[PDB]
């Protein structure tokens, strides 16, 4: 999703955030819903970098999850 995002080297989602995205958004036994989660994260982060980085390493921790995506589903 980051090579597909095209904003490589700048987005850095922590693994606890990844587990929280699993735990909050999508309940499928597949994985494609989580890819869509990470795509929405990548899209909103691409919007955010598009005016400039506040960080060159977007530490996407458990805090900033509904900042790159909708409130926990």
């Amino acid at each position: 999703q980051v090579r597909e995002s095209g904003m490589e080297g700048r987005i850095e989602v922590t693994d606890a955030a990844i587990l929280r995205v699993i735990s909050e958004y999508t309940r499928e036994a597949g994985v494609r819903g989580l890819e869509r989660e990470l795509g929405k994260i990548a899209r909103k982060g691409a919007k955010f970098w598009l005016e400039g980085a506040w960080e060159g390493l977007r530490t996407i921790d458990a805090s900033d999850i509904p900042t790159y995506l909708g409130i926990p589903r």
């Binding site: 995002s5 095209g6 490589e8 869509r36 929405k40 691409a46």
Partner: protein, 291 residues
Amino acid sequence: TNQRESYLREQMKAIQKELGGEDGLSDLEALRKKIEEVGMPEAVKTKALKELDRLERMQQGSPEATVARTYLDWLTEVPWSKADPEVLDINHTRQVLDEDHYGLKDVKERILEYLAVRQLTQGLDVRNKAPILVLVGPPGVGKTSLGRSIARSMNRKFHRISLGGVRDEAEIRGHRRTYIGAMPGKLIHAMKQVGVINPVILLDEIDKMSSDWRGDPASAMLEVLDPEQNNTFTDHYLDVPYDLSKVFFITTANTLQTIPRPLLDRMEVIEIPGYTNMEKQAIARQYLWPK
């Protein structure tokens, strides 16, 4: 008498070929000229070489030369190496969606995220290997004028092609240029309507495409929806693909469900409701009543 009448008859049918047949050869020569002025790619020059071997007909009824030169009209008329200097500003789109529509401020940002990943492509070429947009709402919502908004917002051009009435894949995959009526679906008709190679092209009411025909035009859409194959998309009528990575397709529906399964892939969903009566007043008083 037979010698004299055959000698004269052949001369008068020869002048008839100078009168009726020669105008067809001359007009087809002019279409060869518009090949040399239009600036084809060399593969599309090879399709023009196929045109050079196809423009040799007295055209009367299902004629090869007329639908062949119609394909030539489409191929010159789908533009070539025009730039459309698209403004690479998400904020330009941000002000356009406000200046042309009221909006909920709940759906504009998804468009802005899409144009953001357009603006942040892994390729230097702008890519669409991510899921592409789909709009669902009332028909009365300004989906096409939002197409105009993303035309002017990205310096592109919007072309009102209502796909929602189109049913047959024979319309969509227009057949071979051997019979007139080998006529493409509305994308090549809108790409006719542009003279720059990267326009705003809208895809309309895929819920309202119910498969009332042999063949699946949703499969043909999947041939133009996946960016790894829109650039390799031909119908029957095309043989060298017009690349549609530059030719952006936004999909847009109204009902959530009767979209075909081969088009539910590469979707990102945008659901728009109607307008509150105050918002109806707002859109009326600043847009519709001034309109």
